[PDB]
Amino acid sequence: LTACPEESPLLVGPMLIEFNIPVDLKLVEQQNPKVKLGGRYTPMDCISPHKVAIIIPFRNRQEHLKYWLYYLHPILQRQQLDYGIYVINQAGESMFNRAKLLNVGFKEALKDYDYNCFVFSDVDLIPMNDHNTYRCFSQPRHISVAMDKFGFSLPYVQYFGGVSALSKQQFLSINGFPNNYWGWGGEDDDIYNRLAFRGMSVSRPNAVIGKTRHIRHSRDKKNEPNPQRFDRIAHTKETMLSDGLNSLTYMVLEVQRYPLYTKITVDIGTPS
Ligand SMILES: NCCCCCCOP(=O)(O)OP(=O)(O)OC[C@H]1O[C@@H](n2ccc(=O)[nH]c2=O)[C@H](O)[C@@H]1O
Ligand SMILES: CC(=O)N[C@@H]1[C@@H](O)[C@H](O[C@@H]2O[C@H](CO)[C@@H](O)[C@H](O)[C@H]2NC(C)=O)[C@@H](CO)O[C@H]1O
Numbered sequence: 014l015t016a017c018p019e020e021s022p023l024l025v026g027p028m029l030i031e032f033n034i035p036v037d038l039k040l041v042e043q044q045n046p047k048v049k050l051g052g053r054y055t056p057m058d059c060i061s062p063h064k065v066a067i068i069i070p071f072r073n074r075q076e077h078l079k080y081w082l083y084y085l086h087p088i089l090q091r092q093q094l095d096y097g098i099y100v101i102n103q104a105g106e107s108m109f110n111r112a113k114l115l116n117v118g119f120k121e122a123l124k125d126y127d128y129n130c131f132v133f134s135d136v137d138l139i140p141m142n143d144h145n146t147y148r149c150f151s152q153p154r155h156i157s158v159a160m161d162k163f164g165f166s167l168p169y170v171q172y173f174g175g176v177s178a179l180s181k182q183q184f185l186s187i188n189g190f191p192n193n194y195w196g197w198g199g200e201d202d203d204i205y206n207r208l209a210f211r212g213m214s215v216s217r218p219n220a221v222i223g224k225t226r227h228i229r230h231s232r233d234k235k236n237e238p239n240p241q242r243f244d245r246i247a248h249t250k251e252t253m254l255s256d257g258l259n260s261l262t263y264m265v266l267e268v269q270r271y272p273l274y275t276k277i278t279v280d281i282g283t284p285s
């Protein structure tokens with residue numbers, strides 16, 4: 014087997030993404046036969062250099078996940094990636110912690126395979142063009158550059174939320190993500206500040222290939238805006254050495270393999 018081409022010849026480009034449609038994972042499982050237990054997939058006709066672990070922070074977002082699985086599996090396969098899908102389900106009902114959930118995904122995914130790249134994706138964002146490759150680059154990669162929710166514009170130049178990707182080394186270089194952001198907002202700006210503090214830049218696909226759709230939804234109880242968020246992002250320099258992968262503590266309550274994804278239910282503590 015030879016290494017897959019730099020660009021995949023299976024790519025179609027712009028695709029039609031809609032969410033009025035109903036989804037059945039059985040059909041999805043059925044439409045995507047190459048996808049093995051736990052949502053793992055490896056190219057059978059070429060060797061791919063990207064061993065990607067796609068991490069999804071999660072809690073009470075099953076319908077969104079269904080659409081995510083429905084659209085992304087066919088896409089990822091076309092991108093000729095050797096990947097796996099990890100849904101990090103937060104147990105309990107205390108304040109949501111997006112970033113800590115992502116750190117957990119990093120540690121748990123490594124237990125399965127030697128992934129070298131990590132894509133962190135909100136459950137409700139779907140790429141509109143398969144040229145927007147879900148892998149890592151020489152620089153941390155911001156993937157959802159043109160979200161319809163923001164009218165295809167970056168809400169602000171340093172925006173690093175939605176979907177992003179960090180190689181195993183880039184992730185390790187910043188001590189992973191912070192564990193101290195409970196509730197909505199800021200965790201992603203902290204991460205962006207971490208990158209800059211370790212001397213890195215952000216790589217992005219152009220605004221046309223980077224178009225992506227966000228599933229319109231309402232607020233989730235227990236993920237209200239975090240008031241101390243402004244104060245935390247202004248002090249990232251002082252807290253990133255101690256808050257992150259090296260201070261990460263959680264408890265896996267269960268690991269369930271579903272055909273389209275591995276679901277890891279975890280107790281990540283409470284704020285204080
Ligand atoms: N205009 C309506 C504003 C809606 C306010 C809710 C905030 O919306 P967003 O900024 O998109 O974030 P989110 O989509 O709520 O949270 C980010 C992501 O974390 C995850 N997430 C967050 C909260 C929750 O209860 N469950 C969950 O699974 C999920 O992957 C989600 O995609
Ligand atoms: C009205 C306005 O422009 N508000 C800005 C905020 O939207 C913005 O908050 C950030 O918004 C992103 C888009 O949803 C979030 O991903 C991000 O977490 C959130 N950050 C914080 C700290 O709340 C901030 C950027 O710091 O600026 C406001 O002006």
Ligand SMILES: [Mn+2]
Nearest residue numbers: 135137227230
């Ligand atoms: Mn959302």
